[PDB]
Amino acid sequence: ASVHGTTYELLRRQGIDTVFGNPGSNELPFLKDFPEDFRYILALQEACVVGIADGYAQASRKPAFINLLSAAGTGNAMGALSNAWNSHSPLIVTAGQQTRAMIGVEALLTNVDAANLPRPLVKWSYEPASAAEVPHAMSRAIHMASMAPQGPVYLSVPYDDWDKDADPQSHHLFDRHVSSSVRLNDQDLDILVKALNSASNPAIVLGPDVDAANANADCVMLAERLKAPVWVAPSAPRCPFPTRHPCFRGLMPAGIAAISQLLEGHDVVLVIGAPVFRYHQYDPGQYLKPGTRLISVTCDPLEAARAPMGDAIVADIGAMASALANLVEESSRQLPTAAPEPAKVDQDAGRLHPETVFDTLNDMAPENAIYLNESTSTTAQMWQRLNMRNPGSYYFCAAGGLGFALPAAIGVQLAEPERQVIAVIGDGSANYSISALWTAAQYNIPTIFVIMNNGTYGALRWFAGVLEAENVPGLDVPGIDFRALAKGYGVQALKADNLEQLKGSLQEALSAKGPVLIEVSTVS
Amino acid sequence: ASVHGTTYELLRRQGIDTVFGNPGSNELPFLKDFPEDFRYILALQEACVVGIADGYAQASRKPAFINLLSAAGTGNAMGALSNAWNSHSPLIVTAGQQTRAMIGVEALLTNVDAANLPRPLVKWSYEPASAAEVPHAMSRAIHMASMAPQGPVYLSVPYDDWDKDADPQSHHLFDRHVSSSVRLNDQDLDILVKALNSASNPAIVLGPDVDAANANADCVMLAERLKAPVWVAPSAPRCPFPTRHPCFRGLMPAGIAAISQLLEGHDVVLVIGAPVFRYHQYDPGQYLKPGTRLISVTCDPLEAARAPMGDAIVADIGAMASALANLVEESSRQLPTAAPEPAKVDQDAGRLHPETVFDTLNDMAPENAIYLNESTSTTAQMWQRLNMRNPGSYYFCAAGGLGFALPAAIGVQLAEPERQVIAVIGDGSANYSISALWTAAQYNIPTIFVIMNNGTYGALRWFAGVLEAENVPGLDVPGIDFRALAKGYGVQALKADNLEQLKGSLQEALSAKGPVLIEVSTVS
Amino acid sequence: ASVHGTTYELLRRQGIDTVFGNPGSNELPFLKDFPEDFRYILALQEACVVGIADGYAQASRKPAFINLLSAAGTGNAMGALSNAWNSHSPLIVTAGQQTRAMIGVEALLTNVDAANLPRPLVKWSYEPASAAEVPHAMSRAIHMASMAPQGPVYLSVPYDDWDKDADPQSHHLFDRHVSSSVRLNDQDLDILVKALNSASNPAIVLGPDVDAANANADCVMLAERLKAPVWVAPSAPRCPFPTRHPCFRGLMPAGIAAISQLLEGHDVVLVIGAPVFRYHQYDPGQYLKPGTRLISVTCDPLEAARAPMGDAIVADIGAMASALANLVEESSRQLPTAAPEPAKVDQDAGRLHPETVFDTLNDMAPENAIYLNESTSTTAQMWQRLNMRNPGSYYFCAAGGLGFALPAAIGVQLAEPERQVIAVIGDGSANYSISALWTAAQYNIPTIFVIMNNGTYGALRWFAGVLEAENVPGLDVPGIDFRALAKGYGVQALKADNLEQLKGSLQEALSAKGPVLIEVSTVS
Ligand SMILES: Cc1ncc(Cn2c(C)c(CCOP(=O)(O)OP(=O)(O)O)sc2=O)c(N)n1
Ligand SMILES: Cc1ncc(Cn2c(C)c(CCOP(=O)(O)OP(=O)(O)O)sc2=O)c(N)n1
Ligand SMILES: Cc1ncc(Cn2c(C)c(CCOP(=O)(O)OP(=O)(O)O)sc2=O)c(N)n1
Ligand SMILES: [Ca+2]
Ligand SMILES: [Ca+2]
Ligand SMILES: [Ca+2]
Ligand SMILES: [Mg+2]
Ligand SMILES: [Mg+2]
Ligand SMILES: [Mg+2]
Ligand SMILES: [Mg+2]
Ligand SMILES: [Mg+2]
DSSP: OHHHHHHHHHHTTTTOOOEOOOOGGHHHHHHHTTHHHHTEEEEEEEHHHHHHHHHHOOOOSSSSEEEEEHHHHHHTTTTHHHHHHHHHHEEEEEEEOOOOHTTTTOOTOOOTGGSSSSSTTTTTTTOOSSSGGHEEEEEEHHHHSSSSOOOEEEEEEEEGTTTSSSOOGGGGGGGOEOOOOOOHHHHHHHHHHHHHHOOOOOEEOOOOOHHTOHHHHHHHHHHHHTOEEEEEEESSSSSSSTSSTTEEEEEEOOHHHHHHHHHHTTTTTEEEESSSTTSOOOOOSHHHHHHHHEEESSSSSHHHHHHHSSEESOOHHHHHHHHHHHSSSOSSOOOOOOOOOOOOOOOOSSSBBBHHHHHHHHHSTTTOEEEEEETTHHHHHHHHHOOOSSOOEEEETTOOOSSHHHHHHHHHHHHHHTSSSEEEEEEEGGGGTGGGHHHHHTOOOOOOOEEEESBBBBHHHHHHHHHHHSSSSSBBOOOOOOOHHHHHOOOOEEEEEHHHHHHHHHHHHHHHOEEEEEEEOOOO | OOOOHHHHHHHHHHOOEEEEEOOOGHHHHTTTTTOTOOEEOOOSSHHHHHHHHHHHHHTTTTTTTEEHHHHHHHHHTTHHHHHHHHTTTTEEEEEEEOOOOTTTTTTTOOOGGGGGGGGOOOOOOOOOGGGHHHHHHHHHHHHHHSSSSSOEEEEEEEGGGSSSSGGGGGGGGGOOOOOOOOOOOOHHHHHHHHHHOOOSOOEEEEEEHHHHHOOOHHHHHHHHHHHHHHEEEEOOOOOOOOTTTTTTEEESOOOOHHHHHHHHTOOOOOOOSOOOOOOOSSOOSSSSOOOEEEEEEEEEEHHHHOOOOSSESSSOHHHHHHHHHSOOOOOSSSSOOOOOOOOOOOOOSSSOOHHHHHHHHHSOTTTTOOOEOOOTOOHHHHHHHHOOOOOOEEEEEETOOOTTTHHHHHHHHHTTTTOOOOEEEETOOOOGGGHHHHHHHHHHHHOOOEEEEEEHHHHHHHHHHHHTTOOOSBBBOOOOOOHHHHHHTTTTEEEEEEEEHHHHHHHHHOSSSEEEEEEEEOOO | BHHHHHHHHHHHHTTEEEEEEEEGGGGGGTTOOOOTOEEEEEOOOOOHHHHHHHHHHHHHHHHEEEEEHHHHHHHHHHHHHHHHHTTTEEEEEEEEOOOHHHHHHTTOOOOOTTGGTTTSSSSSSEEEEEEEEEHHHHHHHHHHHHHOOOOEEEEEGGGTTTSSBOGGGGGGGGGOOOOEEEOHHHHHHHHHHHHHHOOOOOOOEOOOOHHHHHHHHHHHHHHHHTTEEEOOSSSSSOOOOOTTTTEEEEEESSSSSHHHHHHOOOOOEEEESSSTTTOSSSOSSSSTTTOEEEEEEEEEHHHHHOOSSSSESSSHHHHHHHHHHHSOOOOOOOOOOOOOOOOOOOOOSSBBBBHHHHHHHHSOOOOOOOEEEEEEHHHHHHHOOOOOOOSSSSOOTTOOOSSSSSHHHHHHHHHHHSSSSEEEEEETGGGGGGGGGHHHHTTTOOOOEEEOOOBOOOOHHHHHHHTTOOEEEOBBOOOOOHHHHHHHTOOOOESSHHHHHHHHHHHHHHHHHHOOOEEEEEEO
């Protein structure tokens, strides 16, 4: 067998059947004779390729496979990889290298010092020393991406390797099963359970690895048993809990002082599947108030190491959440009371308040909708106003890198064809990966894109105001016609300048058979 | 003085007055109180920011300054940096880092292991150990970018550093002059000159560092004195010689065998300002034929080290070209005869042959036009059909990374306001950095964009055909309306479905007061 | 509190009380006011410092703390770090950096790009961005070294940081408990147990992480229950099983074909705490024979990823071994028969056969002796001839890097004062870290060093013979007087030119109150 044949067999035997790519000359020998059981999803720029694959992986809860051209293609994707690192997304990034005979002279398209290029944003990065090693290196990539803590990996392959003879002993790779589905030993787990049972006023904080593990329902049972309020850890990339459950307390502010204040009076705080903590703003103070102790369950040694406070346990989130949910006592305390409904913001017949948009989405979207957020000044209101009952219902750029949501929403929609995906994206953010729209059109992936257009980088204006920073350039982005951009890439386009138009446009979009972009005129 | 004040003073004292950027929260403390004598050029995505800065630097022959947001912003620009490395572009890339107090916890927007992120695509990469070091680190960045061989550099700055007190001793940085304007010692230069004088059939090959050095006119004199044919080294990022000069022989094919065959019978081949050589296709054979010896003058030790044949001299291209041009004897041999004019390809009243487009551009464009090429299947014809008399008249992605020409053409036009820039870009390539169009509209930078639309990634189809590679996915890009994309970003748009429309559209574009995009229907 | 005070408090609260070091100017501000409850162990060169710390960590089963001077001191230790990486040794390597104000100018003793220096041989490598971050960075280092898979880490600290004020919130670091004591979830563990119970002819292979975990006794129970032969995985850094237990089958040859042949007929092979596999010699063939399936339990994702065959489970070795030992059925098969005693090699009254030396050591050493091996041509015989009943009884350079055993034997002896350490080291190997002898003398650490002197690099002569490689230089090391070297560093020295002298010298050494070196004349 050839390296080509052996590698595709390994991929299919390991459950991979889709290649997200933007093709180049170093990859043609890999892509030729493309297997009939595989599908190829083209995107027009590599940030888009990786964003789509990322959404697909996160929603499918399985690795996604990417193919890019050498250094330039990899380079165009590195902002997307920064998000993927923070979301623990299992991505296998392959990049074609020059033929081995032309690497030394640094022919055009040689990826120089290739393995160093995507560092430090990958778990493992490698170029094999010979063609026959390629299937083994691919096996390593698959497992490195897939083991807890999941994350992106990188493999560089000289284009002449594919046609070479494979090692017959590569067949041992095909069916390898590698597990990191582990939990704390019984003795120490019993100690943890007793500490939770004994707490007088426990609180729970959940992060994105809960949703990645589909541990959401187990966390609901845990919270119900402990009668504990539940917060989502700050800078949340995913939604780990039903947002109208009585225990739910919303998104934590991303500040040190703010969080210790919220946790004041809680004697034991159990954090599951989050860094401790993904703060953002400068908000100095105590990490925890006296009387609060913190216990973190994380899938990632790097998270456990860097937490500035608390104990930690490094284990699989699914296995730990299930065990805890089924082992803790049913507390006799009263179940927390549900948060009150959000206020209706006054809305005239003109430009839309973001609150109006979220309320209307919540009113009209199906109960199993999936939302993506890249409307950076409106996150707090979004979190308060969307009832997200089910797992896998929310995604936000995990490293704060704009250009995620537009392509990721296409990948999520591909992963979940029966769940309507609605991406709420600011006018500024929409541009970073605008060309991803084309993929939705070409493959008829029926994502709805809601562009919140207020003409400015609003979150930056807000932060400037905080800093009392005057005379900052580059904060306004006037003069973008999003309906024209949508037309450019073949996506149906609607406009909503007021509430009645928003309702009409959403009705049309929800009944459409293809992707739709709605440009919403929002308040400045 | 503050670090902010001291750093802007250093920048202005070192000739920097423009910041190319996409703003983020870690950069607001740098951008606040933006000096009135500086200008800020916003682009909507970081590949665009860097592409614009790159074109500006290459055309201006001076460093350009870039400001990006942390890891995600830097990451989005890494494909653009791959080109900049290969073109020796003097780019100073600054990226804002989290406040020092929040780096340890890896708060959102922390650039982890920051200096490693852009490696291996930068000459120098650094994060200072204290705020007071920032001006010195900036000085290092300026000089590292600017010394031969020029190239991109990276500086990461925690956002809290800017407001801190500067070291008064930083004033010694302001007026430092650093020179690498060096040439071979007299004794060895005399040996080289004698070898050139003694050659019976010399040939000259020129690369992009000739144009970067503005050594073009000196190379013309050298070629005239030696009565030598002149080729442009393969995969050419720039044009180093007047393309209708009698000595000119065009673009070398990017193959080992092809080049040794072209050089056969030439006893001494002098290469100036090029790698030896930027081959691309697999074309095995002899590096040089018997009877040919090669001497390379390069600004880059890495080029000299990796050449598989010939002697080399590492020195400044401007200084070496000037010295050689003025020292060699006037040969009594006959001056080479000019290449014949290109044939006119038969053209009916339908879709345009690329040859027709280039002939028409050559007929209608001003003699001091500047062209950019990202029409990947048409490069050979472009090189044959455009009379480029002046320096700085051609740019092509130096690492082969698409997404360069569209933003770079805006930067070039900004650098050269009196020279009409015309970017010829394929329908595939146009998408990578499509959002750069907005910058041209916003700042009214009157670049003309000619989109060669044939619905496919033609160069890849061609290479697949060569490989006899069947069943390759992802090679077609139907369904893109470039006039709508132009409208989306505020750029006047025209279409040309045939020759009469092409002529009409070019006439309108050449007389326009702002940027213009022309979508040309080209043959498949 | 100062950063100095806070950091030493963190260290002591995390169980660290010893600093292994070679001092330098960048570390004087750390070492000043050295706490009275800490001890400092000086060694004369940094390979020795790290080797001693490594032996100490491995034997103590807890992290060891190292302090070195900048780049040169770190650099001198990098061979020692290569071994530490392969043995998963929990080492915290700190290196002093220049004062922050002098880093930019690259003053003497600046560690340039410090975090990159020890890569790729460390789990985590870092320089903090401010003095107040130092305690947090130290906390990260402690936990990164200590979490499974354990390994070395690196922290660079500017010397001016120590005297600065600490953040009062650093107190939250002091008592953090971080656990990776995890095992496979119940459902999947039950599946594994059933597979073991159902095996008709199981085999067990054990690696060094078993001994590191003190899982040895649990593995004995597991082997007894399954009635399974037990091998030690190739290139063994530690001994994971009693070598005279009836199930023991010895050290596996480090070859692909050899191992699949040994395993032929075994239907299920359970590997615990080893890479699959640390082969050495080229010995091509089948990874496994038909009819054999392999299941690996490893603490290290990198091991699980790269295994070319088998299933894998990534978990704590102690937790997994305990669970398996207590869950499997008692097989009704016959217990394996103990390996026969080794043959006595004919020995005349002249130079010693290595077999004679090992037999005599086995005859005379206490039953709780600890051996180290750096006698590279005699490993197979050593493994056959020493009865090692207890855990922690054997160490061999895990990356094959010579210079380990001599210093490591001192660290092991320091860790285990009641167990006589006997290091068997070839004449070649003895030189790499010869200066470590001084530390044994100075601190009166009573290690016995047995130098096997045959005047040559015997293992290399053997491998050359295999390659049929003639005319290899540099294989002989005549003219070294090891008794004089011992005298040089203050260690009592004896010679043994024949068996009667060997017995006499060992009797004297075993009754000595300090370290002793015995130079043994062995056969060529
Ligand atoms: C790749 C990248 N570039 C720049 C930024 C900086 N940035 C920018 C530019 C924001 C403004 C986004 O504008 P928007 O129109 O999408 O939404 P709002 O007006 O609601 O803020 S928020 C923010 O962090 C970023 N996070 N990521
Ligand atoms: C960043 C990046 N991605 C992908 C490629 C691969 N690529 C691609 C996709 C080409 C086709 C460009 O299509 P076009 O429409 O711009 O021009 P032609 O039809 O004349 O080839 S040429 C080529 O090398 C690349 N060079 N750089
Ligand atoms: C740091 C280092 N340098 C060189 C070697 C190469 N080497 C060398 C030099 C060996 C010979 C050791 O000689 P010895 O006297 O200690 O033992 P033998 O005579 O029994 O081989 S075995 C071996 O792998 C090595 N493993 N590590
Ligand atoms: Ca906006
Ligand atoms: Ca095309
Ligand atoms: Ca020897
Ligand atoms: Mg990198
Ligand atoms: Mg699905
Ligand atoms: Mg100018
Ligand atoms: Mg290194
Ligand atoms: Mg002890």
